[PDB]
Structure 1
């Protein structure tokens, strides 16, 4: 195998720090039946800040890993903000049922994302503002029972603020990227390229392919990325694989000599 001569980290020219301060340090949270979904787009989002914060009571990534969260760039990120009872923390998972899981907030089975929650007993409890009763069904029609949140109650009766960081997967030009330093794009070398999480190894050549403008990367018959579009330069680059072949040693036998001839295959 021709070994990769270099590596390419390629991310688009976005420098925006991502607003998690209005999400996790919010002065008000929604109820579980009227949950606040906030669209997050076009930002350099560092999720290691959320992962290294010890103020969070739980951290459950399912489709990805929190160490790999900064290594991937997402298309669309939605933060399901709701204030729920801490006993129903375990209902925020794929394939469950409950008072919040089956009525107030249904979460999909094939869910790719992370769920972060923390106690808000010193913030929301004093209170009956937060009420409860298909995926992502926000039914707000009124039949609605309120939460009895008080700070002198038990741990299972303490108010907990839950943010469900759902991530739409990469089938498109992505916009919500992580803190990755972009590199210069070397052409006609076997490189370990990285186009917003589309890692791989091959020879990057210029191509005459005409993408549609809503398409990030082309694909092949073998479900492999045949071509990409550079997120900083609107050009269509093929990925030719590195030249590989078997090794076949021609030997006349050790009874005659130790001199061998190496035939490479095709």
Structure 2
């Protein structure tokens, strides 16, 4: 098992426990990189109303790793949580926050009825990942007495799994590498069985993986 020997932890707390979330018309996009991403914390936590993955299964996130992870953070109304998904359409999915229909990742949300609600009129709404900064602009007055009409804090985790150098990898310890023997290998989440030998293949500095005709490694 081989992963970059990095000990930095990924700042998920700075996304999920943020003092204030952005409005959906002007959603934030935080880059997560050069760190260890422990997704067991987010998955096991009971604080979430939903944790729905469209890309990969949530329990595989600990082994699998990414070139980059982005956290899209904003506030929506509760009944609109269902619209943040690939393949969905509607007044939110089409007008203010669009995902790719080939989106890879997980949509995590929880209510903020005991935090953002007051009324709280600071939340305004109006291509994939577009930030669109008689008007098209409308807003909500969130009050603690409003379930489907309560505010929700939603974080969308977009994962890039393209075969390239990984920077965000799970909490998995590496092992030593053994050459010229049949082994079961895992390089940055890429697995297979074979004999690992020294080579004279001059990879360019930006290249991480090589491929054969069959698209195998």
Class of the TM-score when normalised by the shorter of the 2 chains: over 0.9
CA distance in 2, matches of 1:111, 1:203: 35
The 3-state SS of whatever aligns with 1:100 is coil
> Higher Cα Rg: structure 1 or 2?
1
Shift of 1:170: 2.9
The 3-state SS of whatever aligns with 1:104 is coil
Shift of 1:134: 1.2
Shift of 1:142: 7.8
1:80 to 1:183, Cα distance in 2 relative to 1, 3 A: same
The 3-state SS of whatever aligns with 1:223 is coil
CA contact (8 A) 1:57 1:117 kept: yes
Shift of 1:17: 1.1
1:132 to 1:190, Cα distance in 2 relative to 1, 3 A: same
TM-score of the two chains, using structure 2 as the length reference: 0.97
TM-score of the two chains, using structure 1 as the length reference: 0.80
1:218 to 1:143, Cα distance in 2 relative to 1, 3 A: same
1:141 to 1:217, Cα distance in 2 relative to 1, 3 A: farther
The 3-state SS of whatever aligns with 2:142 is coil
Aligned to 1:176: 168
CA distance in 1, matches of 2:54, 2:9: 25
Shift of 1:188: 0.5
CA displacement 1:28-80 (0-9 Å, x = unmatched): 10111100100000100000100000000001111111110001111010000
CA distance in 2, matches of 1:216, 1:27: 39
1:10 to 1:141, Cα distance in 2 relative to 1, 3 A: farther
CA contact (8 A) 1:74 1:177 kept: yes
The answer for unaligned runs of 5 or more in structure 2 is none
CA distance in 2, matches of 1:99, 1:121: 23
Shift of 1:141: 14
* Range that drifts further, 93-102 or 30-39: 93-102
Alignment length (residue pairs): 216
Shift of 1:159: 0.5
Aligned to 1:137: 130
Q: Identify the structure with bigger relative contact order (alpha carbons < 8 Å, sequence gap 6+).
A: 2
Please point out which of 82, 106, 114 is paired with 1:114: 106
Shift of 1:12: 0.8
Aligned to 1:247: none
CA displacement 1:193-221 (0-9 Å, x = unmatched): 10011100000010000001111110011
CA contact (8 A) 1:99 1:132 kept: no
CA displacement 1:111-152 (0-9 Å, x = unmatched): 110010001011100011111121111001983101121111
CA distance in 2, matches of 1:37, 1:192: 37
Please point out which of 17, 35, 48 is paired with 1:25: 17
Aligned to 1:263: none
CA distance in 1, matches of 2:91, 2:122: 17
CA contact (8 A) 1:120 1:161 kept: yes
1:208 to 1:141, Cα distance in 2 relative to 1, 3 A: farther
CA displacement 1:173-204 (0-9 Å, x = unmatched): 01000001010000001100100111000000
Q: CA RMSD in A?
A: 1.3
CA distance in 1, matches of 2:9, 2:214: 38
